[PDB]
RNA sequence: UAACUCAAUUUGUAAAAAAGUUUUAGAGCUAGAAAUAGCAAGUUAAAAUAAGGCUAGUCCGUUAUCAACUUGAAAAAGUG
DNA sequence: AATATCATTTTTTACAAATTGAGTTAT
DNA sequence: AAATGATATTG
């Protein structure tokens, strides 16, 4: 004999809840074993309890750090390549100079060679500097001077191009030559095209509003505004924009049908010109080779200062003026400082600490930080005008090597780096033989779609080698399969096909499919004329000219483009219904419209003898995104089609994979059919059935086809689509529901409920984006931690005006303005900004019973399409926010609105009911059927969340971890309640297998059942039906305020391990220490300094002897030492040597006890303590308010009638604060802390009801389980007062819980 | 539940940049036995960027998984 | 012991798959 | 983005 038991857990990101109830919505308890050396053999605990575990964490970090950390290999591996070339003709002018260059980082001590490292003397090397004193300088007058260099001073300028070589966002080699001598060439190539719109330019240099320091579409503004007759959406705007690094649309302005639009930092352009200056004439070639001259000019301009007459070498030349500059504004800033506030020079010039000129360069300072130091000092002192003008700019003693050197592409270094080669290839021959690796070695880089360049030991690696050998930037189109590895790369990630899972999926741009998908959309659309007694279903045989009229002549077929073209003509039926399809079928034969115009052809493209050659054409243009592979791909079926009919072919590309195979679409037939699922949706006879009713029919083998030609845990858990943060409850919830059925002498439950719960910068990058985009200059009149309240975040995202009826807003009374809701609260529970609104006033919206009305829907509609073109608000807040205009939400939508805050649909939920109901329904009946002797009931977050705000059992997070254990309770009785009184449900609420205010009665009212006082409900509620009675309204909410009021509830934290980076990754200087760790192997952190602060993986309990005095009498010791991350692989390997390496002497290997952190010790007078690592624990214990202070605590922090027992029952507090003082003096041993708490509460106790609740939640913090916090007790803050040593341990009892609690083996450390 | 259309999220992967940091080049100069005064400099660079690891790749090295006892390389099972 | 200071950062390109919420057709 | 262990300084 075991009674019937259910379960109610609470899944969280933090916490998994659970509970055990019986028949009578009680919790049972229960006496477990106690194992180990203890007193106790025994103990009684409540089956109700928590498990509290760290949140899980996404794979990013680790991922940005292993991509971070390949490209450090290989850039490497770039020098160590232009060495190898420099190898033989090094040594013959320098012994051992890489060698030098090798140990530079080495003190002169471990250093080998002479500590001088380009020339190995000092009158060379200390005159080296001297002469260029930055290695732009040696850059420059390498690509300029015809003289011979010395081969190592060109080492150091190829290698330093080569090391920092810039960026691959562009495309095709640029070339500086260059702003207003070239705009001007664009108002005349122009000129003479529109010979009626002369656009004048007038004598304003250009050069002026281009070239300054503000952003992009900013500067195009100041221009279109300037040239009064020319519209800036035009195309001498279009070709503006295109000019300083936008994309334009080129299509109305020749007359064109596409949307021939460019890019200039693509191949993509070079093709894109051929396919516009094929549609227009040649002539048009000299507007967009005006703007390539002018766009490149403006990616220049903002990176370097310096015209192109001079040098061969725009960017280090640049540079070297920073520099000179830089010279020049320190020596007048020097004796500026002399002349006038001599008194402030040491601090500006000597001290680092300070943020002046010292802290810029040698100390710790960034610019902004040296800047606004500055500033104010340069303010003051007269003569320093310029200075400011230079600071004021961005401009005043720049490094040449800044956080914005990220602009410079390759292009720019490639340029240096070849005039170096192009000079010495003249004396050195090695430099002509080898130009070409030299330059490849800056050029060459792995396209994303090959990935690691592995040979089968990575994990990440999928790229395949065309033949085995080591791969170089050089031999690496040759030894690697380029496209085989970049169809690999989509070909893993893109699905199976759901009813084939070994076959493949076709791409969602496949004729074959598209055809499929129109066909599906026809077969059902239904019609009316004025003689025909019911609307018929379309003709099967006569379908197969509607496609070849309406569908194949266009992109996009209309309902009226239908109704009025195919009954005009075709169907010479005047007037015409249509029941099927809403205003335009939502498929399109895109690809067929895409493929005539491509081809010229609707004769080979309308041909289905031979389809297959067109399946691949279209699946390459899917499969791959550079062109270069396209084309190879391509090259085959070029075989037929002409220059112009397989090159404008390398243009269309496409995107996406359906959902279904070829095989499913077009193969898996029937025997007693004769016909394919897409040969039968073009004339199920006059039934016309549906692809999901085709498979679903009895009728055929396809129902079964499917089923028929169809993993651990871990792997389940890991398949789910949500934050891995979840997926950890998910696991655990599994994992303690696995446990409690043990428990319960492994007897599966009757039921089993389930529950689950739910950048400043980044919104000033759609916020200022936004806003910005409109055009008005209101961030020039009110231009980040400011948009977390609400109210100021909402103000700037409406252009400073109200939402419904668009007048202007206020700043300093701006606390009146209300925030409504869209979808009234009453319908959506979105706390979301994209349901929140904020106006003059929510009574201004229209009523709250429905949508915002059809008349502020009309005004400000216009309004509406306006806010989503600058993206400050989505498509889903535009389409409710004009709900009216498209009828109002119904009484079925508000039915639905009233169901879906009840009844879970959010996928995980199902996907956790899924893993459960599997788990436990293991059995079959005589007709083959699942025995469901367990019921999975899926219950929403806000069901016991209200339940307890209606029937007086409120929640305070902050008193214990018990309310995650309450609520997982709670949702055990709803879960058992809900599913007796309303039995119809278990296909709402179970996973197994205008009128409409019947159905938002029942679910708006559905909670009430467990009421007495709505306008006079029964007492024992029952089923309507059967005798079995659910709810005595007496005895059954006393039980559960009785459950609440159990003091003892198991509270687990899960044990775990630490893994990760193994310290603070800060590289600090070298600090005589025992602390510091060395960064590499032979680098003595004494010398070369290193990282401190270790994470440790785990501690362990270590009893051994440590030698005492020269004498080396070995004492006894006992005591945690902690295993570090980095450690930790050592210590596995051999336990013993690793800590016999440590000092310690005989260890007792067996005594050894892994205690990974959360370990929890029972001290004395149940005291406990969790270890945090070796060195620190974190209070273990957790105290249980009684049900008492508890509710209390919710109304004295916050109808009328129970705000009377906040008043009385009042001065609870002097209760409620001792239970606090009784835990924080016998477990918690804070003193002087305690003894500010009570001496602060004394002195408060004239402040208000309230203020002294609120103020005590506060005070929780101080007995919370967990590490220390600091917290204020009104205006006086108390820090935080943590436990420093694990001595108090060592002698204690350890621990080890179960995941539930409830069997424990606790283990007295009196033990040597 | 399944296909479809339109638009946000979320997770996972790949290839790239610029910085930051550390040590070493970059002869400090005078007055003093020193302590310490004056004045001159400053912008650059090499190298490392998880210690490292064997499978030796231009690869891998920070996610996920973890009570205790007995059993297993492990995954996992058994135990109250 | 009480107390104070500390924590690598930013930027771009390419791809796939669920999920969510507003629509059409069904089982 | 905090939050909490490692670090070093205190009389």
Redesign the pocket.
């Known amino acids: 004999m075991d009674k019937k038991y259910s379960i109610g857990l609470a899944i969280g990101t933090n916490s998994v809840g659970w509970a055990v109830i019986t028949d009578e919505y009680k919790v049972p308890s229960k006496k ?4 180990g050396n203890t007193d106790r053999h025994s103990i009684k605990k409540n089956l109700i309890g928590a498990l509290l575990f760290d949140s ?24 160590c390549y232009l060495q190898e070339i420099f190898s033989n003709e090094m040594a013959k002018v320098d012994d051992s100079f890489f060698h030098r ?2 140990e ?5 001590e471990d ?1 080998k060679h002479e ?4 020339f190995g003397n ?2 060379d ?2 005159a080296y ?1 001297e002469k260029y ?3 732009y300088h040696l850059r420059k007058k390498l690509v300029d001077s015809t003289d011979k260099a010395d081969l190592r001073l060109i080492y ?1 300028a190829l ?2 191009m080569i ?7 562009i495309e095709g080699d640029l070339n500086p030559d260059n702003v207003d001598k070239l705009f001007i060439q664009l108002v005349q190539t122009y000129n003479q095209l529109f010979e009626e719109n002369p656009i004048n330019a007038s004598g304003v240099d250009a050069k002026a509003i281009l070239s300054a320091r503000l952003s992009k579409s900013r500067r195009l503004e100041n221009l279109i505004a300037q040239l009064p007759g020319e519209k800036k959406n035009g195309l001498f705007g279009n070709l503006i924009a295109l000019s300083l690094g936008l994309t334009p649309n080129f299509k109305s302005n020749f007359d064109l049908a596409e949307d021939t639009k460019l890019q200039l930092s693509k191949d993509t352009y070079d093709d894109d010109l051929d396919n516009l200056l094929a549609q227009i004439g040649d002539q048009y070639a000299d507007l967009f080779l005006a703007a390539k001259n002018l766009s490149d000019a403006i990616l220049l301009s903002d990176i370097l200062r310096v015209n192109t007459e001079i040098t061969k070498a725009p960017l280090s030349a640049s540079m070297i003026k ?2 000179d500059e ?2 020049q504004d ?2 007048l800033l ?1 004796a500026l400082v ?1 002349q006038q506030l001599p008194e402030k020079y040491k601090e500006i ?2 001290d680092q600490s300070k943020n002046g ?2 802290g810029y ?2 100390g ?1 300072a ?1 610019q902004e930080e040296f800047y606004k130091f500055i500033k104010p000092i340069l303010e003051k002192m007269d003569g320093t005008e310029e200075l400011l003008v230079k600071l004021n700019r961005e401009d005043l003693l ?9 602009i ?1 592409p390759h292009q720019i270094h490639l340029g240096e780096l070849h005039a170096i080669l192009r000079r010495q290839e003249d004396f050195y021959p090695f430099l002509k033989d080898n130009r070409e690796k030299i330059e490849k070695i800056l050029t ?12 089968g ?5 999928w790229m395949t080698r065309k033949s085995e050998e ?4 050089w031999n ?1 189109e040759k030894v690697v399969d380029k496209g085989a590895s970049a169809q690999s790369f ?1 070909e893993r ?3 199976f096909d ?1 009813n084939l899972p070994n076959e493949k ?1 076709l791409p ?1 741009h496949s004729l074959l499919y598209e055809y499929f ?1 129109v066909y ?2 026809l077969t ?1 659309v239904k019609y009316v004329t004025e003689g025909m007694r019911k609307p018929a279903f379309l003709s099967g045989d006569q379908k197969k000219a509607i496609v070849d009229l309406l569908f194949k002549t266009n992109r996009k077929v209309t309902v009226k483009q239908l109704k009025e073209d195919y009954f005009k003509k075709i169907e010479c039926f005047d007037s015409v219904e249509i ?4 205003d335009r079928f ?2 399109s034969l895109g690809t067929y419209h895409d493929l005539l115009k491509i081809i010229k052809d609707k004769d080979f493209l309308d041909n289905e003898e031979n389809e297959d050659i067109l399946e691949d054409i279209v699946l390459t243009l ?1 499969l791959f ?1 550079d062109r270069e592979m396209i084309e190879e791909r391509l090259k085959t079926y070029a075989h037929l089609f002409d220059d112009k009919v397989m090159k404008q072919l390398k243009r269309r590309r496409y ?6 195979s070829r095989k499913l679409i077009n193969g898996i037939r029937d025997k007693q059919s004769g016909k394919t699922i897409l040969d039968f949706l073009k004339s199920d006879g006059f039934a016309n ?5 085709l498979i ?1 029919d009895d009728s055929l083998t396809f129902k079964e086809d499917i089923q028929k030609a169809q993993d ?3 792997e389940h858990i ?1 398949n ?6 979840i ?2 409850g998910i ?2 919830t599994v ?1 303690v529901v696995d446990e409690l059925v043990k428990v319960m002498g492994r007897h599966k439950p009757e039921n089993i409920v389930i529950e689950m719960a739910r ?3 980044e919104r000033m990058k759609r916020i200022e984006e936004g806003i910005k985009e409109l055009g008005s200059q209101i961030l020039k009149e009110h231009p980040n931690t400011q948009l977390q309240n609400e109210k100021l975040y909402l103000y700037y995202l409406q252009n400073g005006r109200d939402m419904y009826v668009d007048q202007e807003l206020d700043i300093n009374r701006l606390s009146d303005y209300d925030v409504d809701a869209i979808v009234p609260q009453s319908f959506l529970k979105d706390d979301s900004i994209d349901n929140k609104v904020l106006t003059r006033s929510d009574k201004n919206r229209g009523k709250s019973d429905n949508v915002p009305s059809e008349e502020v829907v009309k005004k400000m509609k216009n309004y509406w399409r306006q806010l989503l073109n600058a ?1 400050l608000i ?3 807040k535009f ?2 926010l004009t709900k009216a205009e498209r009828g109002g939400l119904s009484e079925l ?1 508000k039915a639905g609105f009233i169901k879906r805050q009840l009844v879970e ?4 939920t ?2 956790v009911a899924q893993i459960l109901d599997s788990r436990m329904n293991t059995k079959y009946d005589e007709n083959d059927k699942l025995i469901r002797e367990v019921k999975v009931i899926t219950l929403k977050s806000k069901l016991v969340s209200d339940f307890r705000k209606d029937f007086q059992f409120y929640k305070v997070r902050e008193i214990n971890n018990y309310h995650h254990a309450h609520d997982a309770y709670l949702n055990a009785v709803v879960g058992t309640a809900l599913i007796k009184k309303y039995p119809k449900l278990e296909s709402e609420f179970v996973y197994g297998d205008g009128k409409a205010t019947a159905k938002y009665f029942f679910y708006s009212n559905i909670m009430n059942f467990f009421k007495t006082e709505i306008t006079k409900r029964p007492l024992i509620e029952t089923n309507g039906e059967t005798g079995e009675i659910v709810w005595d309204k007496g005895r059954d909410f006393a039980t559960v305020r009785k459950v609440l009021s159990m003091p003892q509830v198991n509270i687990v934290k ?4 630490q ?4 310290s ?8 005589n ?1 025992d ?1 510091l760790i ?5 680098w003595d952190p004494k ?4 990282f ?3 994470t ?1 993986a785990y501690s362990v309990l270590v009893v051994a002897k440590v030698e005492k005095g020269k004498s080396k009498k070995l004492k006894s010791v006992k005591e945690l030492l ?1 295993i570090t ?2 450690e930790r ?2 210590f596995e390997k051999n336990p013993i040597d690793f800590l016999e390496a440590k000092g310690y002497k005989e260890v007792k290997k067996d005594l050894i006890i ?1 205690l ?1 952190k959360y370990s929890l010790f029972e001290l004395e007078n149940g005291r406990k303590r969790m270890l ?5 624990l ?1 209070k273990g214990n957790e105290l249980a308010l009684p049900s008492k202070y508890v509710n209390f605590l919710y109304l004295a922090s916050h109808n009328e009638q129970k705000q009377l027992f906040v008043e009385q029952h009042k001065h609870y507090l002097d209760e409620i604060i001792e239970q606090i003082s009784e835990f924080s003096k016998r477990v918690i041993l804070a ?2 802390n305690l003894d500010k708490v009570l001496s602060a509460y004394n002195k408060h106790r004239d402040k208000p009801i309230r203020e002294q609740a609120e103020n005590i939640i506060h005070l929780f913090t101080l007995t919370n389980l ?2 220390p ?1 600091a917290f204020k007790y009104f205006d006086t803050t108390i ?4 436990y ?2 694990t001595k108090e341990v060592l002698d204690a009892t350890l621990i ?4 539930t609690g409830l ?3 606790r283990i007295d450390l009196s033990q040597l």
Not at 104 to 108: K, T
Not at 115 to 118: A, G, L, M, Q
Not at 163 to 169: A, D, T, V, Y
């Open positions: 477990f074993k106690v194992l899980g964490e996404t794979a990013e970090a680790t991922r940005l750090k292993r991509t971070a950390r390949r490209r450090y290999t290989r850039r490497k591996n770039r020098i260059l090798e530079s980082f080495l003190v002169e250093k500590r001088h490292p380009i000092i009158v090397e200390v500097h004193p930055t290695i150091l290698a330093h090391k920092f070589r810039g960026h691959f966002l920073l520099y830089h010279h320190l020596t020097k002399r010039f000597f000129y010292a360069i040698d710790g960034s720049r490094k040449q090597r800044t956080f914005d050197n990220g410079i060459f880089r792995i396209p994303y779609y090959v990935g690691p360049l592995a040979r030991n990575s994990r990440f690696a080591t791969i170089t930037p690496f989509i990630m893109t699905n759901k999926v969602k998908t599906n959309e059902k029941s099927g399809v809403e939502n498929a899917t995104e995107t996406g994979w359906g959902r279904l059935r549906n692809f999901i009713q679903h651990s845990l871990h890991a789910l689509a949500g934050s891995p943060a997926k950890k696991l655990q994992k950048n400043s910068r993206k989505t498509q889903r389409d409710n939508d649909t959010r996928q995980i199902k996907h899960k044990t775990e391990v893994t990760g980076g193994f603070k990754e800060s590289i600090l200087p070298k600090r220490s602390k060395a960064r590499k192997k032979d010398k070369y300094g290193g401190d602060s270790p440790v902690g991350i980095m692989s050592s892994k990974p945090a690592s070796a060195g620190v974190q003193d002087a967990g590490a916090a820090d935080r007062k943590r420093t040593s080890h819980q179960s995941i069997y424990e083996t």
